[PDB]
Amino acid sequence: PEFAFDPTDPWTETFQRGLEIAGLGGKRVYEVGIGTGINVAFMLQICEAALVSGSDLDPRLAGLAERNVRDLAPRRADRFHPVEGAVSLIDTPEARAQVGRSDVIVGCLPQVGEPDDVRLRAPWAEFDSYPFNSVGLGLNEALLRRTRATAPAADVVLNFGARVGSAVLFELFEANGYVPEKLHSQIVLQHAGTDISFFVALENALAQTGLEREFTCEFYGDPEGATRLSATEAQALVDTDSAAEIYHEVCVIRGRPA
Amino acid sequence: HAPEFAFDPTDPWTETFQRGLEIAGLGGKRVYEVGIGTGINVAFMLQICEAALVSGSDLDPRLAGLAERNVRDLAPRRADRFHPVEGAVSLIDTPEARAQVGRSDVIVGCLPQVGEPDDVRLRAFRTAQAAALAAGADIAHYYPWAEFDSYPFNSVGLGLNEALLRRTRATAPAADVVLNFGARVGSAVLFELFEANGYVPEKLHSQIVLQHAGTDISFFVALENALAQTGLEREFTCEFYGDPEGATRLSATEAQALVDTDSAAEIYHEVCVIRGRPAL
Amino acid sequence: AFDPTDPWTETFQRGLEIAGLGGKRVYEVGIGTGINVAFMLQICEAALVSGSDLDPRLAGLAERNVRDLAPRRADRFHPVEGAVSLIDTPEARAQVGRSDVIVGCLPQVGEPDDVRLRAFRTAQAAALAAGADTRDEDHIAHYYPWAEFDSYPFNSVGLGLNEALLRRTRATAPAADVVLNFGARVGSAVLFELFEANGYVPEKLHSQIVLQHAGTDISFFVALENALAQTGLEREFTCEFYGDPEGATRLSATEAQALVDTDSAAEIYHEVCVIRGRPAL
Ligand SMILES: Nc1ncnc2c1ncn2[C@@H]1O[C@H](CSCC[C@H](N)C(=O)O)[C@@H](O)[C@H]1O
Ligand SMILES: Nc1ncnc2c1ncn2[C@@H]1O[C@H](CSCC[C@H](N)C(=O)O)[C@@H](O)[C@H]1O
Ligand code: MET
Description:
3 copies of one chain form a homotrimer.
Chain A: H1 10-22, E1 28-32, H2 38-45, E2 51-56, H3 61-72, E3 80-86, H4 93-101, E4 104-107, H5 138-150, E5 155-161, H6 166-174, E6 178-189, H7 197-202, E7 219-220, E8 228-229, H8 231-240, E9 247-257
Parallel strand pairs in A: 1-2, 1-4, 2-3, 4-5
Antiparallel strand pairs in A: 5-9, 6-9, 7-8
Helix pairs in contact in A: 2-3
The complex binds S-adenosyl-L-homocysteine (2 copies) and methionine.
One S-adenosyl-L-homocysteine is lined by residues 11-12, 32-33, 35, 56-58, 88-89, 108-110, 114-115, 118, 123 of chain A.
GO molecular function (chain A): methyltransferase activity
Protein name (chain A): SAM-dependent methyltransferase
Keywords (chain A): Methyltransferase, S-adenosyl-L-methionine, Transferase
């Protein structure tokens, strides 16, 4: 089914590819950030979810995502029950009740390193305290706190830029009650006009305390990930160059609780 | 509905707490107060809220002594429902207190936090002297703050509140938790302190209160110059108000300014009671 | 009995003796050479013991070791193979999931500086008393690991890996006691907070005053006494050092760095204690 996914958006594609590997067959799925519903359409038509629910921060997409679903997978669009309203993460009673019933919570959420291209406009400071905000995933840690409390037996499947390393993405889950599994990964290319200052800032400042530290971000010179390079190095070609071609992993990780 | 007399209209922080406590619905519940202090809150929960049973503790072990006396003199017909745990108790960190918390339906508290009236410590002291008359002329004494500095929400001055939420979730996972906050950092943060720690927040009640004159707000000004990376920028504006009604808003700097020009200007902020319900 | 050349492990083993593991099933993170495994088996009388180590070979070396040190028992020692950081393999979680007590003496700012060197030597000694007669693969090339634990709140006092462990045990074995060895330079309240912050009630099982080797850098602890709180407003933080072997004469990190300046070689002691975390039952 290499026709279902579309290579237009590599982030979205690796998400859907992991969603498939996830094994959503006959499950109740909640999607945080349904956006336009395509992932819902995909999870209903290709992965065969028994029921899909979800929400979005934007009060209007929930309704629009019902159309696309009705149009893109008409025969299964009666298993889609969005939760309407401006729902940040899962913070309304209905969302919690729906999340409380799901087997799998899935999403691809804001995180430093996402393509700027997003929003594209046709939720930040309260998350700043989170320990894993230090590497840009505060919002993702915020969801895991809620999921472990609201549905402690549900899987959680999330999409990540992997510039910060796989050991740390895994630690985001281990720190919050889940054992992670990488379901799918892909090397993508980032636009040429994209700012990675935050990642070179990572490998330069010191540890929690004034303590010694070695750390390098995972970047790639080629679209195959053959040659590696640190945040400081990939910024070189983009200093002596202007359109150099930089790559980084994007991956989908499942967190499965005890 | 509780008449308009039981609420302390002399200290608005306590008044907000008490109006909150009555909306919380403590009738018939077993309550545990972190920091019983003088016990006037206990008197209120027994006499006005109809608590079936109120327990609690305090860091200074003399208090619970005098708390009984005040309860007895304010709620004589219900004083037999008040069983505090004796001894110096920090948060709930003693076996007796953990045993009491584990049996309570609701844990309530108006804990130390950055932004509280700067005269709160001094008031407490004085009361120690007095009241502790029956002491025959007589530690930490104040929740140290070193050990609660690791907590993430200590970044907004709520580390001790967070330490409690970490304790209540482990020891009384079904219990509601009702806490008093100054709301300078805004309700998004206050709610997130609960969501981050296992609780669904609900704001029970809130008031615009006047901050004493000459109160330091530099910590809150410092929060707005929200330092970049990692990462990175953030617009963060604290919530202050110029008029009691709270119609005119200001930020920590816009307020640190109002005072700059005219010392004595009037600066208001919100105090609110939030309940955490475990998604249980 | 114990070794006098290694206080941390003397106090750690003592602790184990006080924890009352008679009858229990235990899991040790960082089994190393197997000396605590034998110590629990033979002195503590544990029902059965399991454990793992980051170094993937130690597990093989350990079973042998035990067999020689705990020949009678030792049938009750089932290690888990593989390079196991903390408890992060399905087999490890399986074994942790069914233990009554997880125990560990784990890397941490303020551990002895020569601790990596003692382990190399201890591995070298043991894989000779069992063969050997090899080269220098008795050797953690790890480095690897430390960065993923940088986000943990208690890593600001150098206990990040220890916190990272508690998050795992709480989820994997919510009813299990967790017994851990710490240098108490940052103070007993901070150590207690580490458990209390992560769903455990702490208890100090045993504590010893130990000598700091001279030469040990302690600028990190003096740095605690100077930087401000997360506020960041002023803070009052004093580390717990001592001037004497009995912990009579208290002393903070800054003044302890005074001495060393002055004398360049003064004794300097601090506390090592075993704390059990027990979760609400
Ligand atoms: N705090 C929040 N809670 C719920 N949904 C959110 C949210 N913040 C953003 N969203 C929604 O999440 C959707 C995707 S935003 C994440 C895009 C991702 N970086 C990628 O490359 O694919 C958007 O529709 C947005 O409305
Ligand atoms: N991340 C990790 N996961 C599991 N075991 C680890 C580990 N890091 C180190 N270890 C193990 O811990 C042991 C030595 S660390 C011991 C130092 C201790 N502070 C003391 O002074 O006594 C070795 O067996 C080592 O391989
Ligand atoms: C055995 S790894 C030890 C390193 C330790 N975390 C330190 O920085 O002191």
